[PDB]
Amino acid sequence: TTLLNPYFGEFGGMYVPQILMPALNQLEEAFVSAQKDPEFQAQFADLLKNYAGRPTALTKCQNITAGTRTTLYLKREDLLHGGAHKTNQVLGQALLAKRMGKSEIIAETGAGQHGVASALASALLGLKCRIYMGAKDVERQSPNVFRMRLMGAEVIPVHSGSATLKDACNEALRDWSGSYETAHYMLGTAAGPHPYPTIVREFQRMIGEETKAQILDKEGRLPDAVIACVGGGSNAIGMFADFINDTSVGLIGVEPGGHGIETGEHGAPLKHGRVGIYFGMKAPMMQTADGQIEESYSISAGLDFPSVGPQHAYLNSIGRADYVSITDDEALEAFKTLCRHEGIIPALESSHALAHALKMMREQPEKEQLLVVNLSGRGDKDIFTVHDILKAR
Amino acid sequence: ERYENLFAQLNDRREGAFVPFVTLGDPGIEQSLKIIDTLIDAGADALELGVPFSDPLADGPTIQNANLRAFAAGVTPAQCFEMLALIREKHPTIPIGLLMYANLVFNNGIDAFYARCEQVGVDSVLVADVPVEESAPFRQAALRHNIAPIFICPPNADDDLLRQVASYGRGYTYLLSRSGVTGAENRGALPLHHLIEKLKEYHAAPALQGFGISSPEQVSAAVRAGAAGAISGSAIVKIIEKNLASPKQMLAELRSFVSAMKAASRA
Numbered sequence: 072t073t074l075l076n077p078y079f080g081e082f083g084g085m086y087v088p089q090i091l092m093p094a095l096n097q098l099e100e101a102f103v104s105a106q107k108d109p110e111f112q113a114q115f116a117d118l119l120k121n122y123a124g125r126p127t128a129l130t131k132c133q134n135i136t137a138g139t140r141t142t143l144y145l146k147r148e149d150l151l152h153g154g155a156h157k158t159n160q161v162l163g164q165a166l167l168a169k170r171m172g173k174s175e176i177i178a179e180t181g182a183g184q185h186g187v188a189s190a191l192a193s194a195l196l197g198l199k200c201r202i203y204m205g206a207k208d209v210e211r212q213s214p215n216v217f218r219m220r221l222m223g224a225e226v227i228p229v230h231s232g233s234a235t236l237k238d239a240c241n242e243a244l245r246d247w248s249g250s251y252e253t254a255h256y257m258l259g260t261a262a263g264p265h266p267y268p269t270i271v272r273e274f275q276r277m278i279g280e281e282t283k284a285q286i287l288d289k290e291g292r293l294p295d296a297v298i299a300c301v302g303g304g305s306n307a308i309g310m311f312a313d314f315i316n317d318t319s320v321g322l323i324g325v326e327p328g329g330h331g332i333e334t335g336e337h338g339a340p341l342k343h344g345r346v347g348i349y350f351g352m353k354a355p356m357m358q359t360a361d362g363q364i365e366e367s368y369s370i371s372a373g374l375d376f377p378s379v380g381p382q383h384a385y386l387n388s389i390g391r392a393d394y395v396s397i398t399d400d401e402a403l404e405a406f407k408t409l410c411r412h413e414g415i416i417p418a419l420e421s422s423h424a425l426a427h428a429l430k431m432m433r434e435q436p437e438k439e440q441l442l443v444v445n446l447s448g449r450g451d452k453d454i455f456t457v458h459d460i461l462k463a464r
Numbered sequence: 465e466r467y468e469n470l471f472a473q474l475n476d477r478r479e480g481a482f483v484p485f486v487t488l489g490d491p492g493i494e495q496s497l498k499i500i501d502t503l504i505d506a507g508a509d510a511l512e513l514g515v516p517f518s519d520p521l522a523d524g525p526t527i528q529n530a531n532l533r534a535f536a537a538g539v540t541p542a543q544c545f546e547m548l549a550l551i552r553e554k555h556p557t558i559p560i561g562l563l564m565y566a567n568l569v570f571n572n573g574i575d576a577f578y579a580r581c582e583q584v585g586v587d588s589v590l591v592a593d594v595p596v597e598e599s600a601p602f603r604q605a606a607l608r609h610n611i612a613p614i615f616i617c618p619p620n621a622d623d624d625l626l627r628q629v630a631s632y633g634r635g636y637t638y639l640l641s642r643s644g645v646t647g648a649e650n651r652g653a654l655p656l657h658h659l660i661e662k663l664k665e666y667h668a669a670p671a672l673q674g675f676g677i678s679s680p681e682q683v684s685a686a687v688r689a690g691a692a693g694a695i696s697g698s699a700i701v702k703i704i705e706k707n708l709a710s711p712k713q714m715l716a717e718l719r720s721f722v723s724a725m726k727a728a729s730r731a
């Protein structure tokens with residue numbers, strides 16, 4: 072028995088060892104209570120405004136759309152404290168942890184932005200934070216490791232499997248299964264077992280709510296489409312949620328195409344995987360014929376995960392949202408374009424969303440369209456990676 | 465019915481069960497088969513057998529590493545079913561349980577999975593990442609194919625959960641010794657007497673205690689506390705890991721250990 076629906080159509084659920092069910096039920100109950108609690112809401116709002124810096128800007132980028140009929144805005148989550156949208160929901164989950172009387176946080180991270188958000192929130196609110204991170208990601212997202220450690224978090228490299236985000240997720244969940252009495256698992260995306268996909272959406276939905284208000288102010292109408300990258304699903308569902316009932320507004324999610332879908336080296340399960348059960352949920356997965364979970368690949372550590380949140384699988388299935396893929400090379404071109412023509416250095420994750428918007432414009436340059444791209448984070452963490460690639464060229 | 469017969473026999477002789485776990489195909493198919501023959505000859509009452517899975521989230525490093533060894537030998541679920549046929553052909557009466565992760569059961573069809581289990585002569589399936597709340601299609605398919613679905617009774621089980629586990633499960637009830645993941649070094653606790661007695665009250669399948677059971681003393685303590693027996697995995701797997709380079713010494717050490725663990729179940 073749960074208070075809220077654990078499923079989105081076929082997708083979702085609570086596929087965890089029995090030991091963890093009380094913890095998930097306790098978290099669900101605390102969330103439902105908090106959502107009705109004006110004092111909780113006021114605390115959360117205060118942190119978002121005065122600590123994190125919400126609301127974030129909506130920037131019109133009128134060099135990159137020159138000569139076309141596309142108008143493009145960027146929702147500037149890169150300006151949030153910590154440098155990505157991850158900060159929004161970590162502040163809410165940290166308050167839930169305190170509400171439940173927990174003193175310790177476990178988190179996984181890939182890009183290191185969720186890790187940094189977890190560390191900063193733990194420093195502010197007086198929690199002991201330990202963060203699992205794949206060893207390959209420790210190397211390719213090294214600036215974030217330094218930031219986490221300076222803020223007092225323990226960062227634990229994971230050498231198992233692909234040594235990337237999936238492997239960090241595995242270790243975090245194994246830890247929680249033994250530590251849940253004292254530790255809250257601060258899952259960093261809209262995936263995993265119920266109630267996480269629901270909590271993460273509700274604590275990210277200010278992205279879309281602000282976007283709506285801002286675009287109505289500037290343009291007097293809703294966007295033709297909103298576009299967001301999809302690693303596990305949080306920044307995309309945060310952008311989409313407030314528009315789901317606005318049927319004219321396209322919702323486009325961008326999965327990592329890696330070296331190309333045809334190579335098998337990608338992270339695009341929604342469109343190229345098969346429903347399975349893993350990481351506490353029934354969702355599209357990259358899996359072998361026999362049902363082993365495959366290793367994903369992306370140039371972007373934050374998108375490098377072989378599954379996706381169940382609400383995106385649902386929105387796809389009913390045709391309310393469309394999902395596409397962008398390759399490493401496409402993402403790199405969009406990264407370079409934004410740096411040189413708008414003076415914004417985007418996260419490589421966010422560069423996937425931008426690359427698809429640029430393709431929408433370039434493919435049909437006389438199509439009138441008003442687009443919003445969620446610029447989910449800044450690219451400081453990626454500058455060494457990108458430099459080394461452009462140099463090798 | 466292999467479990468029913470086993471527990472009746474053990475009851476008549478006033479003994480507990482000792483049930484080893486190993487990963488199928490670790491460290492290879494042929495050696496795995498010989499390992500399992502040794503466990504049985506040394507006095508195992510039943511077997512728990514793991515099908516290698518890419519991401520075993522209820523398992524600590526020892527059994528993670530067993531999975532990796534099996535994959536390095538190229539073991540697939542299909543080969544596991546080949547192995548199970550060979551084991552059942554040699555050993556007609558011993559209860560055989562599988563430890564499964566959900567995706568391997570759900571992959572290309574729940575019903576088809578339990579049908580393959582029945583065809584090969586498996587007796588029970590424990591799906592580690594399916595709680596009772598998600599269990600309906602699994603337990604229904606299991607019962608349709610005369611397979612016992614195994615459920616977990618955790619240390620902090622409430623009354624509602626005890627009632628569900630007693631109603632839905634068959635074969636044996638898995639009495640979890642502690643929170644956390646599998647591992648020999650993390651010992652855990654004595655069978656909560658209150659859980660043992662409540663499961664009996666509700667006519668649950670007999671309880672086997674597992675997680676962190678690594679010594680004869682702990683086996684004796686489980687039976688004294690009223691459990692029908694005990695499961696040991698990591699302790700067994702550690703003997704495999706330690707002796708990879710000497711398969712003869714591996715079997716001798718497994719025999720000695722299993723013999724002692726079984727003796728402790730007679731206490």
Ligand SMILES: O=P(O)(O)OCCNS(=O)(=O)c1ccc(OC(F)(F)F)cc1
Nearest residue numbers: 088522563592646647675676696697698
């Ligand atoms: O001796 P140890 O500590 O290695 O434990 C042996 C466990 N082997 S097993 O197949 O019974 C087993 C049983 C249940 C498991 O997970 C679950 F409880 F969530 F369902 C995992 C393994």
Ligand SMILES: C=C(/N=C/c1c(COP(=O)(O)O)cnc(C)c1O)C(=O)O
Nearest residue numbers: 180181184185302303304305306373448
């Ligand atoms: C995996 C991580 N980041 C993902 C991420 C993503 C993808 O995650 P979501 O699908 O949950 O938004 C998007 N944008 C930025 C800037 C990101 O850092 C992490 O920071 O641990």
Ligand SMILES: c1ccc2[nH]cnc2c1
Nearest residue numbers: 072073074075076077078
């Ligand atoms: C299952 C399905 C729908 C629900 N709505 C509220 N709780 C639920 C549980």
Ligand SMILES: c1ccc2[nH]cnc2c1
Nearest residue numbers: 179185259260302303376
């Ligand atoms: C996918 C999977 C796990 C994640 N944790 C934080 N962001 C994620 C994306």
Ligand SMILES: [Cs+]
Nearest residue numbers: 139140141142
């Ligand atoms: Cs224009």
Ligand SMILES: [Cs+]
Nearest residue numbers: 302338374376
């Ligand atoms: Cs993904």
